Structures are given as structure tokens and as C-alpha cells.
A paper describes a structure:
Respiratory complex II (CII; succinate dehydrogenase, SDH) connects the Krebs cycle with oxidative phosphorylation, making it a master regulator of cell metabolism. Although data are limited, the synthesis of a number of findings suggests that CII activity is regulated at the level of assembly in some biological situations. This may be a relatively complex process as mature CII contains four protein subunits (SDHA, SDHB, SDHC, and SDHD) and houses five permanently-associated cofactors (covalent FAD, [2Fe-2S], [4Fe-4S], and [3Fe-4S] clusters, and integral-membrane b heme). In eukaryotes, CII biogenesis involves at least four SDH assembly factors (SDHAFs). SDHA maturation requires FAD, dicarboxylate, SDHAF2, and SDHAF4.
To do this, we added an excess of SDHAF4 to SDHA-AF2, incubated this mixture at room temperature overnight, purified the resultant SDHA- and SDHAF4-containing species, and determined the crystal structure. In the SDHA-AF4 complex, nine additional amino acids of SDHAF4 are ordered as compared to SDHA-AF2-AF4, such that residues 66–108 are now associated with clear electron density. Although this is accompanied by a small increase in the number of interactions between SDHA and SDHAF4 most of the direct interactions appear similar to those observed in the SDHA-AF2-AF4 complex, including the intimate interactions between the SDHAF4 C-terminus and the SDHA active site. Importantly, this newly ordered region could affect other binding partners in multiple ways. First, it would sterically conflict with the binding position of SDHAF2 that is observed in both the SDHA-AF2 and SDHA-AF2-AF4 complexes and with the binding position for SDHB in assembled CII. In addition, the changes in disorder of SDHAF2 and SDHAF4 allosterically affect the angle between two domains of SDHA, which modifies this same binding surface. In the third step, the additional organization of SDHAF4 displaces SDHAF2 and forms SDHA-AF4. The active site dicarboxylate-binding position remains occluded in this structure, although we note that the dicarboxylate malonate binds at a distal position in the structure. This distal site is of unknown relevance to the CII maturation process.
Residue numbers in the entry:
A (entry chain B): 66 to 108
B (entry chain A): 54 to 664
């Protein structure tokens, strides 16, 4: 994640969900597929 | 004459992706002297790109039940999935994920210390009636990378023998049993006969039969092709899963969120064409509808670009702040993969292959099948797993996050089957002194080929033909035209020209072998699609729009005449090729409806497809 990196969380703990060691930045499944930086990884 | 080196192992695994590594690790951990033959370095296998999820009914976020995952997978398969293999996979998934965690894969965790799980892939609770399930597990943003490093790393202490940058050419078959594999050492050009009592084919997919796919150029169906060259059937090769919006020239898919955030699809006339095909839902229509609509735009002459072969996804009307905050990273992705500035220009996109449901037919134990006089039979000594196989857990349509799962479950199954039937050090069957000679003859013919057609030109012609005749839009006349074209291109293999005659790192030669393999996969895909006169899962025909089962499952079964096997389509396609002539032969075998234990997991009868 060079120019537009996904937000890394303190202690790798998502402050909203408390997930530890999971996906950074916005929730990858929020549009129904699995997105990273606008790429669809899986669906 | 070529330097020919013979090796002897207990087992040989062809492939070092998630499936092959799971099998090789399992065999080595159990004490089998195991070779793993891989054309790529293990951690460069396509599995490394699988950043997302793996499904397992752990029940950490709510009550779950693996039988509900079974149901979702059967329904998703559109009743072409074999319910015994689906039972096996879904019942094993919770244990498989916990095993991987124990081996060192750091699955993300809830506050309470359980593996965190997400809703994904339309999965449900309570046999479709319980709302959304949350059973999709992951590691940070790198699940597949973590899987490969975990299994590859753990195998090293058990002394798995890796043959890296070796290209498997053919199976060593003798009297209907597999006795190993013959392979090319790509670095030095030598030929290696790797004898073993059991062989596992885990070579991945064949997406590169098409013009746009999500895999790298090395996903060329090589294991499929080895099976075809042995006279063994491939299965369900017409069932290819597409996504509507892959970046033209790259194959990188972009999220439906681009349209959810307000992006729109445009054709060469500047029109928002989804308003025509889906007046209500527009660009947020279903993926199947968007894929079909984009394909018709291109077919009917409204494609964009010099070759009118894609359409546009427009985002530059959205305020840049929204793009940056709602779709962080899309600018970087569009620049990297398309050289496009999304604030100024649209992203060129077209439907793109993502997954191959079809492949080498197996039973639920990973044993490869032949089909003789209407009877399934295992091929002694031969196994397959992962995307190269067709167990078939996915039937006519793979569910999201089930593809990483199949790798670990069926790679493990192959190892377990071998362990249950054999012991380390069992006598390795011998091979005839000239075993493999036809593979060497073919290699030599390509190495000194001096025809008139470049490998890359023939490959591109095949890929374009598959994209234009055998992709999302399927109708008889077009499929029949495509069949003729692929058959003509198969004949053109005899006119190839190669440039490199050397023995050191002759990748020109490897690319030509891969083209031969791709062409065998393409032939079987398109002829199977032409023959299958129905719509099921990923195979949608304009001229046969209905799923054709042994009954009309939209109506009560009482009083219907059940259709003879030969009069319905709820059956697997088996394809064969006479490699010398290109002649394709199709046969069919029943779908397995029985589970492994009906009291534990009931067969799910076919039901109408819900949209
Ligand atoms: C393409 C893709 C797929 C994918 C994904 C993202 C992308 C970009 N994300 C996924 C996800 O988040 N969750 C999921 O459940 N699935 C996802 N997928 C699908 C999944 O990743 C793939 O289906 C899966 O990884 C396939 O694994 P498999 O082990 O079957 O295959 P592979 O990783 O491609 O490895 C193939 C190996 O075979 C060797 N090989 C191939 N041909 C030869 C020859 N001729 N000789 C020797 N070795 C050969 C390759 O070297 C490789 O090691
Ligand atoms: Na593999
Ligand atoms: Na497959």
C-alpha cells in the first residue's frame, strides 16, 4: 500500500469491531464482495 | 538424445499452491518420501493472490452449523455439485481452519479470542431460512500468502523434496495406473522421470484460455492437459466463472463498490447502457446481468477502444474527496493497472475469468476417476486437488471463500487417502526403459519448430476466440462458430515457429508447451459448452434459458415422468481429445446426490434457482 495505504490500527485492533490482526482500513466486505484498494479480490 | 535422470519417491505432488502444499506437507509429515514438482517457486503460486477469506462454520459470531454451509454450497452449485464431496468439505472445514491456526496461520481474532468471521458469498443460516451467516475467516490482508508460507515452511522440517522450476510434461501411465511424472528441468533442459507409487495433480486453473482472466500468464491448464494426453476425461470444463468488471489489459477485478458509490458503465456512444437492460437496478444489477449486458454492448458494436472490445466504468463525475474517502486506493489501482487517472478518465473494463469449476474429475477422497461403460472407476496411483480438480464441490458455480477451503480440505484428503492405503517405502512400481519417450519427442519437435506462426500470435488468437464465442454470452450459432475456430487453431499448432534452440532457461519452449495445453483445455471448454443445451450456474444460454433436470422442480414431483439420463442435463460433462487429430468426444456421468451419511446430512433435492 504505497501511495494510498490502508489505515493500520494501533496494536492491530480495529477500534470499531475490536477485531485483532484483521483487514486494515475500511471493511473489505462492505460492498458485498471482498475489496482492497478498489480491487475485487473475491466475490 | 536428452539427458534423462530417474528418481524414485513414495509420492509426487505436481503443484506447490495451497492444494499441492497441503498434500505434500501431509505426506511428508506422515513419513512418506515426497517430491513436490512446481514450475513456479512455491510462494509465487496464484494462491498467493488470494487475500480474502476461507469459509468454515466455527460458530464464533453466532450459532452456526456446517450442514448450513453444505446447503449453501449445494444450492450455489445449481445441483451439479456432488453432495458427498460437499459434505466432506463443509464438515471438515472447522477442523481444517483450526489446524491451520495451530500450524501458525494468524487468523484474525475477536476481542474474546475466537477466530473472527464475516458474512460473505450469500451464505446463510438454517438451510437458507436463517438470514446471513458469518463464517468467512481471514489472516490480515494476506490469507493466501499466509497459507503458502505456513505450509511450505512447515514442510521443510519433514524434508519434502522440491523440484522448483520443473515443468511437468506428462503422467507416467502404465496399464491404467499412474507411476509418476516426466518433467523438464527448465534451467538446464534435462528430462526427469520421477517415479512414485502415488501422484497428486494440483496444478491450478486454466484462465489463460481467455483474453481476460484474473490469473498470471502461468495458469495454463497443464495438469488438465496431462490428463487429456493420458486418454482420461476432464469434467465440466465449460463451467467458467466470470466477473463483469476486470480492467482491460490487466485482468484485475474492481469492486462492485465502484458502482455502489455512483460509478456508471458507459459504451462507445457515451450511454449509460444499464438503464436499458435493468431499468430499476441499473449498474447495481446482479453480476450475471451486468456481465451479459456488457457482453451484448461489445457484441452489438458499442465497445470502446481501438478494437471495440471493452466498455468504460466512469468515476470522474464523483467529487475527488468522495473517491478518496469512500473508495480509498481506487486511484492507485487504476493508475497502476490501467494508467488511468480516475478523476479525469474512465477505467476500461470487460468481463473477466476468475475461476475454473471444471477440471480433473475426482471422488471425495481426491482419487482421479475414469468412466468406463457407465461406471466410475478410480485410476490407481492418481489424485488431484484444488482448482485443477473437479471433486465437484462447486458444480456450476463456486461460492466466494470456498476456493481456498477446497485446497486445504482436498489436499489433506489426498494425503490421508494415500496414508490409509500405503506405507512409506512400499515398492515403487517400475517403468519401461522408454517410458516418456513421446513427451521427449514432442519437446524436441517444438524446440526445433520452424513453421510460420509465433506462439504468442496463436495464443492471442485462441484467447480472443474464446472471449468472443465461449464467454458469458452463449448461444448455439456463436458457440458453433467458435468451435470451428478453435479446431482450426488447433491445426495451426503444427505450424508453430520457435526462436530459441538452446537448453538453458528456454522459456520460449515452455510457453509453447503451455500453448499446447491451453488449446486442449479450450477445445474441451467450447465443445462442452456447445453441447450443453440448458442454463445452469455460470453457463447461461440465450437459446436454452432453463435448467433441465430429471424432473421439473418448479412443479410438485408427484405424477411427473422422470426424464431418462440421456434426456436431461443434470449430469457432468466428460471430455476427451485425440491429441493428434484434435477430435473431441463428450460423455456424461451422473451427479452424486448421496451424502456420506444421510442421518448426519440429508441430500438436498434440486430446487428452482433463486435470483
Ligand atoms: C486468481 C485469484 C483467485 C482467488 C483470489 C484472488 C485471485 C486474484 N482470492 C480468493 C479468496 O480470497 N478466497 C478464495 O476462497 N479463493 C480465492 N481465489 C481462488 C483461489 O485463490 C484459487 O482457486 C486457488 O488459490 C488455487 O490454488 P491451487 O493450489 O489449486 O493452484 P495455484 O495456487 O495456481 O497453484 C498451482 C501450482 O501448480 C504448479 N504448476 C502448474 N503447472 C505446472 C506444470 N506444468 N509443472 C509443474 N508445476 C506446475 C504451479 O507452479 C503452482 O505451484
Ligand atoms: Na497447488
Ligand atoms: Na476446478
Amino acid at each position: 500500500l504505497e501511495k494510498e495505504p490502508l489505515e493500520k490500527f494501533p496494536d492491530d485492533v480495529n477500534p470499531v469491531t475490536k477485531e485483532k490482526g484483521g483487514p486494515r482500513g475500511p471493511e473489505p466486505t462492505r460492498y458485498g464482495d471482498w475489496e482492497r484498494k478498489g480491487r475485487c479480490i473475491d466475490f | 538424445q536428452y539427458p534423462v535422470v530417474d528418481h524414485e519417491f513414495d509420492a509426487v505432488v505436481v503443484g506447490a499452491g495451497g492444494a499441492g502444499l497441503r498434500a505434500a506437507f501431509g505426506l511428508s509429515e506422515a513419513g512418506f518420501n515426497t517430491a513436490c514438482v512446481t514450475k513456479l517457486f512455491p510462494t509465487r503460486s496464484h494462491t498467493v493472490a488470494a487475500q480474502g477469506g476461507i469459509n468454515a462454520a466455527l460458530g464464533n459470531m453466532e450459532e452456526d452449523n456446517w450442514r448450513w454451509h453444505f446447503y449453501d454450497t449445494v444450492k450455489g452449485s445449481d445441483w451439479l455439485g456432488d453432495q458427498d464431496a460437499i459434505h466432506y468439505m463443509t464438515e471438515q472445514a472447522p477442523a481444517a481452519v483450526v489446524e491451520l491456526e495451530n500450524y501458525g496461520m494468524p487468523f484474525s481474532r475477536t476481542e474474546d479470542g475466537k477466530i473472527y468471521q464475516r458474512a460473505f458469498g450469500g451464505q446463510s443460516l438454517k438451510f437458507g431460512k436463517g438470514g446471513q451467516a458469518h463464517r468467512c475467516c481471514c489472516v490480515a490482508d494476506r490469507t493466501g500468502h499466509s497459507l503458502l508460507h505456513t505450509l511450505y515452511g512447515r514442510s521443510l522440517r519433514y524434508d519434502t523434496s522440491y523440484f522448483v522450476e520443473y515443468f511437468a510434461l506428462d503422467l507416467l501411465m502404465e496399464n491404467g495406473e499412474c507411476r509418476g511424472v516426466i518433467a523438464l528441468c527448465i534451467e538446464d533442459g534435462s528430462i526427469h522421470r520421477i517415479r512414485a507409487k502415488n501422484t497428486v495433480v494440483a496444478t491450478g486453473g486454466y484462465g489463460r484460455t481467455y483474453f481476460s482472466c484474473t490469473s498470471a500468464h502461468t495458469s495454463t491448464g497443464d495438469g488438465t492437459a496431462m490428463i487429456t494426453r493420458a486418454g482420461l476425461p476432464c469434467q465440466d470444463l465449460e463451467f467458467v466463472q466470470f466477473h463483469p468488471t476486470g480492467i482491460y489489459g490487466a485482468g484485475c477485478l474492481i469492486t462492485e463498490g465502484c458502482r455502489g458509490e455512483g460509478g456508471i458503465l458507459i459504451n462507445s456512444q457515451g450511454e449509460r447502457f444499464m438503464e436499458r437492460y435493468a431499468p430499476v437496478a441499473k449498474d447495481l444489477a446482479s453480476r450475471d446481468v451486468v456481465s451479459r449486458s456488457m457482453t451484448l454492448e461489445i457484441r452489438e458494436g458499442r465497445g470502446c477502444g481501438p478494437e471495440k472490445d471493452h466498455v468504460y466504468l466512469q468515476l470522474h463525475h464523483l467529487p475527488p474527496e468522495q473517491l478518496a474517502t469512500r473508495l480509498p486506493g481506487i486511484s492507485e489501482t487504476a493508475m497502476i493497472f490501467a494508467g488511468v487517472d480516475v478523476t479525469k478518465e474512465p477505467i476500461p473494463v470487460l468481463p473477466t475469468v476468475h475461476y475454473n469449476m471444471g477440471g480433473i474429475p475426482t471422488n471425495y477422497k481426491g482419487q482421479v476417476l475414469r468412466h468406463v461403460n457407465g461406471q466410475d472407476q478410480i485410476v490407481p496411483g492418481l489424485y488431484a486437488c484444488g482448482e485443477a480438480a473437479c471433486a465437484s464441490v462447486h458444480g456450476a458455480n463456486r461460492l466466494g471463500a470456498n476456493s481456498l477451503l477446497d485446497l486445504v480440505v482436498f489436499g489433506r484428503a489426498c494425503a490421508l487417502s494415500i496414508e490409509e492405503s500405503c506405507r512409506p517405502g512400499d515398492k515403487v512400481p517400475p517403468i519401461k526403459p522408454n517410458a516418456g519417450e513421446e513427451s521427449v519427442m514432442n519437446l524436441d519437435k517444438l524446440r526445433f519448430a520452424d513453421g510460420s506462426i509465433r506462439t504468442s500470435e496463436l495464443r492471442l488468437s485462441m484467447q480472443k476466440s474464446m472471449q468472443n464465442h465461449a464467454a458469458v454470452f452463449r448461444v448455439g450459432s456463436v458457440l458453433q462458430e467458435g468451435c470451428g475456430k478453435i479446431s482450426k487453431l488447433y491445426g495451426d499448432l503444427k505450424h508453430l515457429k520457435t526462436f530459441d534452440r538452446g537448453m538453458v532457461w528456454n522459456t520460449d519452449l515452455v510457453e509453447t508447451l503451455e500453448l499446447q495445453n491451453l488449446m486442449l483445455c479450450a477445445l474441451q471448454t467450447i465443445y462442452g459448452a456447445e453441447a450443453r443445451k440448458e442454463s445452469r450456474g455460470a453457463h447461461a444460454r440465450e437459446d436454452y434459458k432453463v435448467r433441465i433436470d430429471e424432473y421439473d422442480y418448479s412443479k410438485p414431483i408427484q405424477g411427473q415422468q422422470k426424464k431418462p439420463f440421456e434426456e436431461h442435463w443434470r449430469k457432468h460433462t466428460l471430455s476427451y481429445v485425440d491429441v493428434g487429430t484434435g477430435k473431441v468426444t463428450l460423455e456424461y456421468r451422473p451427479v452424486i446426490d448421496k451424502t456420506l451419511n444421510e442421518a448426519d446430512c440429508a441430500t438436498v433435492p434440486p430446487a428452482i434457482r433463486s435470483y
